[PDB]
Amino acid sequence: LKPEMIEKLNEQMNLELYSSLLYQQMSAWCSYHTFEGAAAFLRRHAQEEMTHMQRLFDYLTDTGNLPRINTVESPFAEYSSLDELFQETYKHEQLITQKINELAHAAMTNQDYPTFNFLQWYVSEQHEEEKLFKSIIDKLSLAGKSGEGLYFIDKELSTLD
Amino acid sequence: LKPEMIEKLNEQMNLELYSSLLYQQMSAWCSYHTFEGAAAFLRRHAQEEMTHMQRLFDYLTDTGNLPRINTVESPFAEYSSLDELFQETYKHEQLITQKINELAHAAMTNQDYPTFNFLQWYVSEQHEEEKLFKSIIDKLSLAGKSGEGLYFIDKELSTLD
Amino acid sequence: LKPEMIEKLNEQMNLELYSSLLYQQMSAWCSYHTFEGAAAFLRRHAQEEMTHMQRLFDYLTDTGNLPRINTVESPFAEYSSLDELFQETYKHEQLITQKINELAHAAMTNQDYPTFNFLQWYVSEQHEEEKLFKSIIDKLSLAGKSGEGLYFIDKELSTLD
Amino acid sequence: LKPEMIEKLNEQMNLELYSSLLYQQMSAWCSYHTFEGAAAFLRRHAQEEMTHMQRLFDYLTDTGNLPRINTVESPFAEYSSLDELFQETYKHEQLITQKINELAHAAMTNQDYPTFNFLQWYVSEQHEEEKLFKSIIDKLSLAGKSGEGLYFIDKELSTLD
Amino acid sequence: LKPEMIEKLNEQMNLELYSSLLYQQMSAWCSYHTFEGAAAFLRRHAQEEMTHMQRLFDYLTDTGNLPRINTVESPFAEYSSLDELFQETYKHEQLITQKINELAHAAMTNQDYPTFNFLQWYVSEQHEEEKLFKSIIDKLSLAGKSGEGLYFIDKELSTLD
Amino acid sequence: LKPEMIEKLNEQMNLELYSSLLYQQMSAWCSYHTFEGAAAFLRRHAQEEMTHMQRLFDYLTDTGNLPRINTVESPFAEYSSLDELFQETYKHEQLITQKINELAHAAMTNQDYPTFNFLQWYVSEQHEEEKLFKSIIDKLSLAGKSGEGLYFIDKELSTLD
Amino acid sequence: LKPEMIEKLNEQMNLELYSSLLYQQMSAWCSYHTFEGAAAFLRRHAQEEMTHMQRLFDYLTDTGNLPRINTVESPFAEYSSLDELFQETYKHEQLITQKINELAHAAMTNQDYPTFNFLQWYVSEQHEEEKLFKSIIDKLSLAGKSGEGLYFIDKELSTLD
């Protein structure tokens, strides 16, 4: 691997690690606010993002490199509502998608076919994730003005996926 | 929960998170240095310490508190050998054990019987952990001290549960 | 057992008996008020509290003592709403928790390790119960302004646990 | 078969093809508007109408004729709401029913007993379809003023049939 | 998705729909001309091309777009023989392959990695399709060229998957 | 397929064939020098390389081309040691990967998306091969300084894969 | 093992290697010429001949000798027809049988009973092969003079042995 790709892969790995902690932190907000269903969904998603991290970690070791875990910023933040919380998760999922595309673009420019091939898994996964997170925001749109609505959506999130 | 208890528990949760990343980082060193067995073993241990973190996370939420994930310092470091690496892991396990004891002591003083009860799981696990890592350092001192031996020990670590 | 511990255990046994009858009485209020789901949940909880009573009864006989069932005050009371009813159950569950902690504190001061050990079961159980009863109050908060909300929560309670 | 019947059967086949595409197009509107449940129901119904087409296609070939697929008009249209969308599907299902009756009437006048016999399947199927599509409009009537209502109906449609 | 991508994909979706109807129409010619085996084979292929259409339809919806089904020209045409018919199908398959390549090229240029990834399924399938239809034209040139042979080839097509 | 691509693909096919016979020849050296485990491993790998050759052969014929097997130079060579041998195999695996990348680049440049898609299987496989062969070299460096060490590694080779 | 037997065994091994590639190449011609059935049959025979090579390679190593793979000339050639191609395969198989007899004869004269014993498998196999290839030519002469016949024979070969 070229130094540029090694570092970009390492940075993405750190981004996935951060994202995992962000969702875990978000779930706590949900629980503290009575949305146990949303909390559970996010916990599940924190675990999923960790998987994304590991896969990158493994790719770096397979290719004879040393993955480096950098300083991690606190994911702690305050949210005004469950809608705002989920809107941010959606915005975040999009940043991840952009980072993957820039990674794929760099792989292609550097003629690194093996890494481009490795990234395909992420490209497919992100398409699915964005769809999923969009729906949630949409549902919140349909029935999110009321606690009974909130109560119902929350119930949905508990098994969503 | 008493404010003081909340803080100590949150601190412990963060220490476990750090500890999980520390072991993930140590396995990378092992892979890079050709010790796939030791690498696989530390990876498994990284996952386990993560469960220790989650257990604390949940306790805080169950008790109506908001766990807070703080900034995590990079666990990146250099090691002169496999022996020095495992020496550091044993010492780090001993630190965790000590922190658990201080928390148990604080729970007792504060007559917080529910938290003290909750901690007993960690006390027992810590006992098992220390013994395990001690055995590893022992084998290294014995069979190790010379290449060929490292091959067999690493081979052992691969499956050591 | 020291006389102090014998009596404290006996009093706790009577408290658990009273609590069982209180929840049974509460379920009647629910049924009389159309909340068959909440009624069912409370009936189930009355039976559970009885178990707590029996376990204490058995501990006293195992140790060669004579458990004594005292006068029981009527648990009858009138409630303004289902929310008030559940708020009282939550307050009651908390009193029970406090009584257990005072019991554990007395056991520790009297160096009665066997009884402290026996109480651990209760300490764990109460942590679970408080959590459970908190959630209900929380749900009532999310969707409890409407009969449709009430109708939905009631439906939940019918299987909760 | 008499020329008149051949052509009427061919036209009906084309009508069924168009209807299939219409429902597919409608499902897209539903999805684009967040009604994934209604979208799924319509997709399923697009596939069903295709079956109706094939059965007619086969009858024409069995009888030694050449079915002809004509120009198909775009089924694209804009709808103001989900209620309007379903009202149109109901009106459309009715047109199909009328076309089948005119087909049965022509078969009878032409003393084409074999085709009248063949149409019986469609006559029965349409009775079922109209009923089904009426209910949906009815349900939309009961609980379709609110997003929570919409949210609930949509949930129903996802498995309706 | 870039507006240009949206348009090309929508166009491709419409081409597949047309292609599905084209094969359905060709099977009719086969039935009428006594080639039941070739008819059954094209029918199966009509259904398959339809799935290609749906896959594109969904992609557009998953990405928050509104797929639009345009007017479909009649696929009706005359053929001088079974050989000429299958020659036309092979050529039509080659056209589809070309269109897929142009779309893949557009996705690359536009750095649309998710769409390019999505198209790989079509690229592979197209490879299988072309080979299949090529084999058919081969057999026809060989065994065909004379009645009796047509009986056996048609017999073959009946089950050719 | 373009002329350049055909030629390049044909060259790669011949390279795989040679690579296969090279590993075959190498296992003999191993057998002759008493390393039955390493011999076994290489024989398996000669077969594997041969499958890579077959897959290319097929692609060429599927696309209507005539694969051409060219003269094959004798792979016979002398090796100083077992590790010298494996170093060679590693270098060779690397060359194959480079050639596969050049082929993927050529496909890109020629907008041959079908061929690019086809090559993806090789790209992923090579990633696995390099990892594997790299591991062997590492194991050899850790415990290959003694007859006893070589003895264990060889034993490990016999069942690797 | 006498040097003369070693040279003769080594020669046969290479001949079998060449034979395998010859059939592989012949299978390509068949493919290019529409005879997918014959191509498949020849593909299967190339693999089979490869095993004849491996068996020789192993005997040489079992006997503490070093098999040597020599340069393999390109097996590429032109064939005017399927008939001529198969006629060449038969002649080639005959050539093989003859070289096996000479080897058996050489083993006898040199009182090399172990090798004579080992060769018996080849003797038995060759008898089978010849019979097989002979039948193919026979069938071709019976029905092979019409594309209809060719088509039928090709279908047969697709599964033959």
From Swiss-Prot, chains A, B, C, D, E, F, G:
Q: Which CDD domains match?
A: Nonheme_Ferritin
An example GO biological process term is: cellular response to iron ion
Keyword Zinc-finger appears in the UniProt entry: no
Q: What is the effect of changing residue 125 to A?
A: Initially reduces Fe(2+)/O(2) stoichiometry from ~3 to ~2
Annotated consequence of substituting residue 93 to A: Initially 200-fold slower Fe(2+) oxidation rate
**Where does the UniProt entry say this protein principally localizes?**
cytoplasm
Record-stated family: Belongs to the ferritin family. Prokaryotic subfamily.
User: What is the official name of this protein in its record?
Assistant: Bacterial non-heme ferritin
Q: Which organism is it from?
A: Escherichia coli (strain K12)
